[PDB]
Write a protein that binds this DNA or RNA. Structure first.
Ligand code: MG
Ligand code: MG
Ligand code: MG
Ligand code: MG
Ligand code: MG
Ligand code: MG
Ligand code: MG
Ligand code: MG
Ligand code: MG
Ligand code: MG
Ligand code: MG
Ligand code: MG
Ligand code: MG
Ligand code: MG
Ligand code: MG
Lengths: 129, 139, 51, 180, 61
RNA sequence: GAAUCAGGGUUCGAUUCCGGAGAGGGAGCCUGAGAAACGGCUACCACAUCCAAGGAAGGCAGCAGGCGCGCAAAUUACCCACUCCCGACCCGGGGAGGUAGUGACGAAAAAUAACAAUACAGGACCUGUAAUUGGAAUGAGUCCACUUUAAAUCCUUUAACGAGGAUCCAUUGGAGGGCAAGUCUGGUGCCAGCAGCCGCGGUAAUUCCAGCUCCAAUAGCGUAUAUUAAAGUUGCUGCAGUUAAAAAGCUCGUAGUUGGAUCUUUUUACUUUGAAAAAAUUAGAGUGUUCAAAGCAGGCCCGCCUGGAUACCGCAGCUAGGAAUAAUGGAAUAG
């Protein structure tokens, strides 16, 4: 069955990206996905996304700009210290110039450049570039 | 596929330890059966006694007579066959002559066109066979 | 039949060596290898032991 | 138990491929230009550079306000400049990665003897070092691989006991005059 | 390269002090100290013979 | 800790530091603060030593040495001077330790020529080639003396000599392809042989045996064997499973593993920080051991100045912040 909601969300965004579609349904909306998409949206890879409330786990319609190469998840959510973070950088990211590893730290769901500034580790959710 | 979950280290470590046995280089270096079966006994060299000069025919398409010696070891009494490498170095060896043998290149496997022979003679009566060949020393 | 052994090495006619000039050894031998390859830029590739 | 130290390291790494003609000719040019006796001396200088680069690439990955990057980065840069392989205009950490091994071969004593006109050839310069005719400021040096620091660049001079700088000509010139 | 050698110097106040607090090989380099001539192999063979004899009869052994 | 190593790893650690163990095998004890002690006793087993046959004495996995075993490993050397230890002790003792010898285990440095003129070749005044010539420079070696040190030896220093074929002579492997380097010459004729692998040799052998040349790395270089990388051919990162090796005949099922969304926009796990963590080794700072491997030294004109850093040290345990993620807990017979 469905064990991981974030994985089915990012696989469906990734499949619609290479099909060249403009919009995509994301079924069940959790709050972890919403906090994941905003980090993708502040760095500007996706457009505005509409969240639909249906008195259960809702749906999200996402506008795609056409900028995304690959949004992936990492399973399990390995705990990552700041010592080991740069070894995840050259295994997930295509370059040191762009791309982000998304962490969930105690100060919230962060990309990896923000976690160095805040000096905290966390569990890894996924990545996008 | 493979289990990925965060508590599956025992399943992964034990499955690995079982599946290490299915290749040749791990199996022969950890059973000890092959260590029991080579006559060196895990050593690189051994001294023995030449019992007999033997002629070994080369595997086809090669058509020569490979000059070898039938050697009984001093360490454990195992009888082996060692090759005598060079043009006419069989004439330096006699019977009841104490030689030093070594491996022959492929770490226990048979080499070249000589069937069932995996050793070669190095020293003959405390004199290296390369020196008898080049005229450096004498018997 | 272990009779014929050392046959070709015995039937080789013996040719003594020619006592010749001492080879230079050390840094100076590398001086020759640098000169004979990178200073002689004559037009022309042929190998160095070609006959 | 004994009061002996056993700390030792090698100074060269032999290359992974034994025979590629691109690399063989490339290491031959450094020998002819700089009068080196064997390819181990090319590899020793090549190995010296790689340790500096591994010390460099480690420090490019830390952030710019870490104390260890500021400390060991500056102690790496100052050691490169006082031996002259790096300019004081290029005092940033990234410029270590642009260096070549010809900069360290430029700073041998055998190189800097010849490029001050004290010798006639770079093959001649290595001979004058081993025969104790060259001094740095007060020390006779018979080591051609002496990396001469930038502070003691001025002080390269002929020796005092040497016939080329001082008195007492050599035993060939004397026993010629002893016969006459 | 020659020219320079470097050592230690030790200037005492009066010579009886220099006989008092000095190594006895350093005083023997100036002809003052006289050690006896006996190898320790010769001196250890004599000791083990003395342990086999008890009493005043060690003195002639 | 060591070797390898992009990141992960894999293998090793008898071996000079810490801890343990045993003194031929076991067992029992005395003394003492401390021993189940073995350069202490007491047995028995094994072995072995003198003997007048009545008896007596034994324990090198201490330093040397010898035998044996083997592929496999050093002098029956000098000394308490340094380091320290013990004693009643400033004085004695130390095969601890130190110094020499044997030492291609290995590691660092570094000779075996340099120049000039000719003879020549070139290149757009510069350079190369020579069994031509020229006197210039030095060590190797020999060797007084100092120094060194317990006394020496070696290195360092300096006289005396010490180079032309500078005979004061550089080897080890190769030359079909992998893979740097010859379709040279002579012999052999599927023979002798080579060859890690594919291969070569049966009368014109680019591969054998030799000569000539040439290549490679060089005071080192082959060879055997363990092992690491190569190996994404053990796959955590990272492998495969239609037909190449391979998904159980099918379903149930306990462990195990993994578990939907939900809330501010109790115990833990996690994350950050603090302690406490043996040095050596590693990383690394400073410093011209003549350089370098090293070493912890040193530097400046009566003495003065100055170093002997810092990091790292899985996990577990401890400490204070953080509260996303992940478990978990409170009021439903209201007890
Ligand atoms: Mg004990
Ligand atoms: Mg024993
Ligand atoms: Mg006992
Ligand atoms: Mg003993
Ligand atoms: Mg040995
Ligand atoms: Mg000792
Ligand atoms: Mg070496
Ligand atoms: Mg020589
Ligand atoms: Mg080849
Ligand atoms: Mg491997
Ligand atoms: Mg790899
Ligand atoms: Mg495979
Ligand atoms: Mg099949
Ligand atoms: Mg089926
Ligand atoms: Mg959930």
């Amino acid at each position: 069955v469905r064990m991981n909601v974030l994985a089915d969300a990012l696989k469906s965004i990734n499949n619609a990206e290479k099909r060249g579609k403009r919009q995509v349904l994301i079924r069940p909306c959790s709050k972890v996905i919403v906090r994941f998409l905003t980090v993708m949206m502040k760095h500007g890879y996706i457009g505005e996304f509409e969240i639909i409330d249906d008195h259960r786990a809702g749906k999200i319609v996402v506008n795609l700009t056409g900028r995304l190469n690959k949004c992936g998840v990492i399973s399990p959510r390995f705990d990552v210290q700041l010592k080991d973070l740069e070894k995840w950088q050259n295994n997930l990211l295509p370059s040191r110039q762009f791309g982000f590893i998304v962490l969930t730290t105690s100060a919230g769901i962060m990309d990896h450049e923000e976690a160095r500034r805040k000096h905290t580790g966390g569990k890894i959710l996924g990545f996008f570039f | 596929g493979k289990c990925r979950g965060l508590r599956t280290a025992r399943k992964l470590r034990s499955h690995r330890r079982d599946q290490k046995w299915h290749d040749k280089q791990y199996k022969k270096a950890h059973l000890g059966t092959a260590l029991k079966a080579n006559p060196f006994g895990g050593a690189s060299h051994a001294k023995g006694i030449v019992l007999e000069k033997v002629g070994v025919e080369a595997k086809q398409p090669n058509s020569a007579i490979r000059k070898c010696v039938r050697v009984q070891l001093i360490k454990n009494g195992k009888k082996i066959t060692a090759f005598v490498p060079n043009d006419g170095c069989l004439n330096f060896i006699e019977e009841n002559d104490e030689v030093l043998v070594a491996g022959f290149g492929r770490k226990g496997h048979a080499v070249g066109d000589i069937p069932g022979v995996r050793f070669k003679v190095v020293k003959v009566a405390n004199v290296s066979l390369l020196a008898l060949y080049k005229g450096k020393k004498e018997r | 039949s272990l009779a014929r052994a050392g046959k070709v090495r015995g039937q080789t006619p013996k040719v003594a060596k020619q006592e010749k000039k001492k080879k230079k050894t050390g840094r100076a031998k590398r001086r020759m290898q640098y000169n004979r390859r990178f200073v002689n830029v004559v037009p022309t590739k042929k190998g160095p032991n070609a006959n | 138990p004994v009061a002996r130290s056993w700390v030792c390291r090698k100074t060269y790494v032999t290359p992974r491929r034994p025979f590629e003609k691109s690399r063989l000719d490339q290491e031959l040019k450094l020998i002819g230009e700089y009068g080196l006796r064997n390819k181990r001396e090319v590899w020793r200088v090549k190995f010296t550079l790689a340790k500096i680069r591994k010390a460099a690439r480690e420090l490019l990955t830390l952030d710019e306000k870490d104390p260890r990057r500021l400390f060991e980065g500056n102690a790496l840069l100052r050691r490169l400049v006082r031996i002259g392989v790096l300019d004081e205009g290029k005092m940033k950490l990234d410029y270590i990665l642009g260096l070549k091994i010809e900069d360290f071969l430029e700073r041998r004593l055998q190189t800097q003897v010849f490029k001050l006109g004290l010798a006639k050839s770079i093959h001649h310069a290595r001979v004058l070092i081993r025969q104790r005719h060259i001094r740095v400021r007060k020390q006779v040096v018979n080591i051609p691989s002496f990396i001469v620091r930038l502070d003691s660049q001025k002080h390269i001079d002929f020796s005092l006991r040497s016939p080329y700088g001082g008195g007492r000509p050599g035993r060939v010139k004397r026993k010629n005059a002893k016969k006459g | 390269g020659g020219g320079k050698t470097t050592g230690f110097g030790m200037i005492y106040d009066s010579l009886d002090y220099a006989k008092k607090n000095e190594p006895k090989h350093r005083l023997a380099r100036h002809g003052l100290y006289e050690k006896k001539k006996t190898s320790r192999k010769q001196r250890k063979e004599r000791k083990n013979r003395m342990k086999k004899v008890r009493g005043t009869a060690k003195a002639n052994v």
